[PDB]
Amino acid sequence: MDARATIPEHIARTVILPQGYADDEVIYPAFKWLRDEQPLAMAHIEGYDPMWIATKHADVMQIGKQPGLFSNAEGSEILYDQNNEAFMRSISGGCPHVIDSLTSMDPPTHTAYRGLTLNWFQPASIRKLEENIRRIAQASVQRLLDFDGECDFMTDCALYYPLHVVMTALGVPEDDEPLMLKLTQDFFGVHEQSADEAARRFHETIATFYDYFNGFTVDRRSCPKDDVMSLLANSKLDGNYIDDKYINAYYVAIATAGHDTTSSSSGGAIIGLSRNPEQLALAKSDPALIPRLVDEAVRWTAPVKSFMRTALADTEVRGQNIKRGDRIMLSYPSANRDEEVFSNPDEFDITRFPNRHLGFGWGAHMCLGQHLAKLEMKIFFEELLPKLKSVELSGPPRLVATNFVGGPKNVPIRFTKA
Ligand code: HEM
């Protein structure tokens, strides 16, 4: 219906809708066409707002850099169809954000709330978790090795270690694993009963989680620890504690943001190594390559498929006239296969350097957890790879049919033990 839309319907459907993300050979050719022919253009398909599709690495950085011009707060920062956004608005007091977490905020609010934990998540602070992360990683590796050379790398291994890491970072006890899996896999899981009923279930379930998290907040105000829950519980702004709604959103955001992404990227690494056995040999003879392996797994997997922005003023990008109120989809996968930046970007190559990928985004909201993600993946692969003589896929990987946080959910493998 919007006269400015120039992206062919079939291409627009492929890049916007969830289904195509389940197959690399569906999604990546569509983005290649856009990068070649309509690098920044408008799409409008039935059931969605009109939107610009940012397919180029340069543009995704330019937009992400300027939160004053391209907003997280103003519209939904997640790519929902109109029906789902309206449902979200109806359970969130009219706001297009289900909780008050960092990705829902614009500066200066954003800057203040991110600032509460920014230092904790920097490499020097994160390095103190090394011993704990190594214990957690070894447990997951043992889990895999307990199989007689056959398992699902995701469901039998990679599902676990990153949740345990985010739990240790927060301060959630080991025994609460079931509740944390419910949080990230069930309540905030991918869909893949009336509206009133769904809304009732939502309000009940989130209240249950927030009651649970409130107990930690109270605990840490009397008995401080070096974990994130303690940091936030004991934080003040303008001389007062942060409201429970911001604290609990922060706990949920950290758990959900840090689990699937890391698991998925780990699966991506195993797919890459399975298809490229020489690279497994390389990482085994030179463990100092593992950080480069980790960055390549994140670039190539690109588990976060999109975030959205709303233009707050008329403005120009790649010679296009973006108008106030226009929504923009940021495609991290398309940026990560941009030929102007990467040679042979469809190839998994652990020696790729430099590797200036946007798997963690770029600019004001750039992944808070990026340093924790890189450290835990490094430690995991340091522990796993010496234990493996070989690894191969036993069947096709199954990827999540989503336009938000996807990548591998199931990675059937065979392996021989070193
Ligand atoms: C391979 C693993 C991961 C990937 C690919 C990833 C990716 C991303 C991306 C793309 C964003 C949006 C950035 C932007 O708008 O520019 C983001 C935001 C965020 N990530 Fe991650 N992430 C990963 C791991 C983690 C971990 C382990 C944590 C926490 C322990 C985490 C916490 C967050 C938080 C809190 C935000 C919101 C930050 C803000 O709005 O200021 N992520 N992540």
Side-chain angles (χ1 to χ4, degrees):
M1 202 183 63
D2 196 306
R4 291 181 300 158
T6 58
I7 294 173
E9 189 194 280
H10 66 286
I11 297 289
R13 284 177 52 84
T14 299
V15 300
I16 291 171
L17 297 178
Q19 309 88 256
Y21 289 91
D23 190 343
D24 288 351
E25 288 194 288
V26 170
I27 189 62
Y28 283 114
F31 282 119
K32 182 171 189 304
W33 187 86
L34 286 173
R35 286 196 310 275
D36 290 348
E37 307 291 338
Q38 299 201 18
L40 186 67
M42 186 164 302
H44 193 198
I45 68 168
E46 187 196 40
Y48 287 83
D49 294 334
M51 61 187 58
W52 294 97
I53 315 289
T55 70
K56 297 286 285 175
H57 184 281
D59 299 353
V60 173
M61 288 196 301
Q62 184 171 356
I63 289 159
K65 258 180 236 187
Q66 300 184 78
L69 192 52
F70 303 108
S71 175
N72 275 54
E74 183 60 37
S76 179
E77 82 277 26
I78 295 167
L79 178 51
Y80 290 121
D81 70 13
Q82 290 166 334
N83 287 326
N84 279 287
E85 188 184 308
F87 179 76
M88 169 175 59
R89 282 178 180 280
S90 77
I91 65 181
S92 314
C95 304
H97 308 103
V98 80
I99 59 177
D100 294 299
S101 57
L102 297 185
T103 64
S104 78
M105 297 171 180
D106 286 353
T109 299
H110 175 252
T111 308
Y113 281 87
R114 190 173 159 108
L116 297 181
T117 70
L118 189 57
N119 277 316
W120 200 94
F121 282 104
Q122 291 329 283
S125 164
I126 287 307
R127 209 169 294 126
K128 295 161 189 173
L129 302 177
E130 186 180 339
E131 196 181 26
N132 277 326
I133 294 166
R134 196 168 303 278
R135 174 183 52 78
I136 288 166
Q138 287 171 342
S140 277
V141 172
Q142 192 56 55
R143 211 184 250 274
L144 178 147
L145 295 175
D146 286 351
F147 289 89
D148 186 23
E150 186 165 23
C151 68
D152 186 316
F153 175 74
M154 296 295 301
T155 59
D156 297 315
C157 180
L159 176 69
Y160 292 104
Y161 91 80
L163 185 58
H164 296 150
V165 170
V166 84
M167 285 165 68
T168 308
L170 291 165
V172 172
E174 290 170 37
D175 286 352
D176 294 355
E177 182 189 285
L179 187 55
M180 295 302 291
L181 285 165
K182 274 182 183 52
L183 180 63
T184 72
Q185 304 303 290
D186 294 347
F187 188 47
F188 288 106
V190 179
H191 322 288
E192 213 159 9
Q193 195 189 78
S194 65
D196 287 2
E197 181 60 21
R200 192 188 61 76
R201 277 177 209 246
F202 168 80
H203 293 306
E204 291 190 339
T205 302
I206 198 153
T208 292
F209 278 113
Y210 279 28
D211 277 347
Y212 168 77
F213 285 127
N214 279 342
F216 291 105
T217 298
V218 169
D219 176 80
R220 294 305 198 272
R221 285 178 183 153
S222 286
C223 297
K225 287 188 183 155
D226 295 320
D227 55 32
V228 170
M229 288 188 302
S230 187
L231 181 59
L232 284 166
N234 292 296
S235 298
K236 299 183 174 188
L237 288 171
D238 307 310
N240 299 119
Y241 287 137
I242 304 308
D243 193 305
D244 289 349
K245 81 186 186 176
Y246 294 116
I247 293 174
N248 295 329
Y250 223 131
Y251 297 165
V252 171
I254 285 164
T256 58
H259 186 195
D260 283 348
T261 48
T262 313
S263 290
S264 180
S265 297
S266 303
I270 285 300
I271 295 165
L273 296 167
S274 293
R275 291 181 183 163
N276 296 279
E278 78 283 355
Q279 290 181 54
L280 174 63
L282 181 52
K284 285 162 64 59
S285 68
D286 192 1
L289 284 167
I290 286 166
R292 285 161 50 162
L293 170 162
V294 169
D295 267 316
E296 180 69 341
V298 180
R299 180 192 72 86
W300 191 70
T301 305
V304 184
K305 304 306 172 183
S306 68
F307 270 107
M308 303 295 294
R309 301 292 195 268
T310 301
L312 295 180
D314 295 356
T315 195
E316 197 186 85
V317 180
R318 188 173 297 270
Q320 302 301 314
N321 297 127
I322 297 170
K323 298 293 113 157
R324 185 171 63 90
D326 282 354
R327 294 186 70 208
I328 305 160
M329 182 189 178
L330 302 184
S331 175
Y332 308 109
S334 183
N336 283 1
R337 313 261 182 132
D338 191 339
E339 307 88 336
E340 235 189 309
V341 174
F342 302 100
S343 48
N344 301 321
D346 293 340
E347 299 182 1
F348 181 88
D349 178 6
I350 71 168
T351 65
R352 199 181 286 277
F353 183 87
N355 189 351
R356 296 176 307 100
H357 68 82
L358 306 189
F360 294 116
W362 192 270
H365 287 84
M366 194 180 190
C367 181
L368 176 62
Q370 66 167 300
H371 308 297
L372 178 58
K374 286 179 253 184
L375 180 60
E376 66 178 307
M377 287 183 71
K378 181 193 81 165
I379 290 167
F380 178 75
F381 285 107
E382 278 178 351
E383 295 303 318
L384 180 63
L385 302 187
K387 304 296 191 173
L388 301 186
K389 188 187 307 198
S390 60
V391 64
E392 63 185 22
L393 306 188
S394 57
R398 191 193 81 77
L399 307 193
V400 182
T402 182
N403 56 17
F404 185 39
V405 180
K409 203 69 180 177
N410 295 98
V411 180
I413 59 164
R414 279 184 301 254
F415 61 91
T416 66
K417 298 174 187 182

